């Protein structure tokens, strides 16, 4: 996260860290949507252009974290994957369309003050909150700039959803209905964006109707980080919910 701020303790208790076994490193962000399912970007697991094809045993899920690098004894929980499910029409070859995957945990995680699932939007939630100007919240342990380095603790930043024509006109990539973009414009003066390591984390919004946090987006892609006239693109979670439900129902 660029131009964010340190997260408060238990501020994002659905935050999940995708961690590589060997060498030990942060692979991406993710989110806890139930006691045994984690949601992240397909490109965190599968990205043939950079030779990424992670399997279950390459990774761990760390839940309840705040510090990036510490082992947060008594606070975090560390879980193994039983199974990875990538959207079958994830388009890595062109624009990361449908950039979404699910990970089933081998065992149920226990909820606590630091571990707790975020809600998934239904059609009305999406309809009412996914509007230009409405702000969402992005969190992650990614880079503080494109080029200080890495944060000591989980970073947070609130960014406004941007009009779809403005998203379009900011890039050469073909934008689909399974994506939305967010970030301030140059004239708004305020800054903020996801950056390298933030991928797969959640873009959430707090419904003013039932006062619950909903994960509307998944950090997908951007051109650089926090560049003027550029925006972060996020997977539209509600549009791919049928797939999410199908996977969880069947598996």
């Amino acid at each position: 996260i660029v131009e964010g701020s340190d997260a408060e303790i238990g501020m994002s208790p659905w935050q999940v860290m995708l961690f590589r076994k060997s060498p030990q490193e942060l692979l991406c962000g993710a989110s806890l949507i139930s006691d045994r399912w984690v949601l992240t970007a397909a490109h965190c697991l599968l990205y043939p252009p950079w030779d990424k094809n992670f399997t279950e045993n390459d990774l761990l899920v760390r839940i309840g974290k705040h510090s990036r690098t510490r082992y947060e004894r008594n606070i975090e929980k560390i879980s193994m994957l039983e199974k990875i499910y990538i959207h079958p029409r994830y388009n890595w070859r062109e624009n990361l369309d449908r950039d979404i995957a699910l990970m089933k945990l081998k065992k149920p995680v226990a909820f606590s003050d630091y571990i707790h699932p975020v809600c998934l939007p239904d059609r009305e939630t999406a309809a009412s909150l996914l509007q230009a100007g409405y702000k969402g919240r992005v969190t992650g342990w990614g880079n503080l700039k494109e080029t200080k380095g890495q944060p000591s603790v989980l970073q947070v930043v609130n960014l406004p959803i941007v009009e779809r024509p403005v998203c379009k006109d900011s890039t050469r990539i073909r934008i689909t209905d399974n994506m939305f973009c967010a970030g301030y414009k140059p004239d708004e003066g305020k800054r903020g964006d996801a950056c390298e390591g933030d991928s797969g984390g959640p873009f959430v919004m707090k419904s003013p109707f039932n006062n619950r946090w909903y994960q509307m987006g998944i950090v997908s892609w951007g051109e650089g980080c926090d560049r003027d006239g550029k925006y972060g693109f996020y997977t539209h979670v509600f549009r791919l919910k049928k797939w999410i439900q199908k996977v969880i129902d069947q598996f």
């Binding site: 003050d113 707790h116 699932p117 809600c119 409405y134 609130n158 707090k206 006062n211």
Partner: peptide, 27 residues
């Protein structure tokens, strides 16, 4: 179920330092 309700915020009726920024943007 109890999803999206934080044990250290909503559940205790405490607000985080920037959630109002979000609310203020939902017009």
């Amino acid at each position: 179920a109890d999803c999206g309700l934080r044990p250290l915020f909503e559940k205790k009726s405490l607000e985080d330092k920037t959630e109002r920024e979000l609310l203020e943007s939902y017009i």
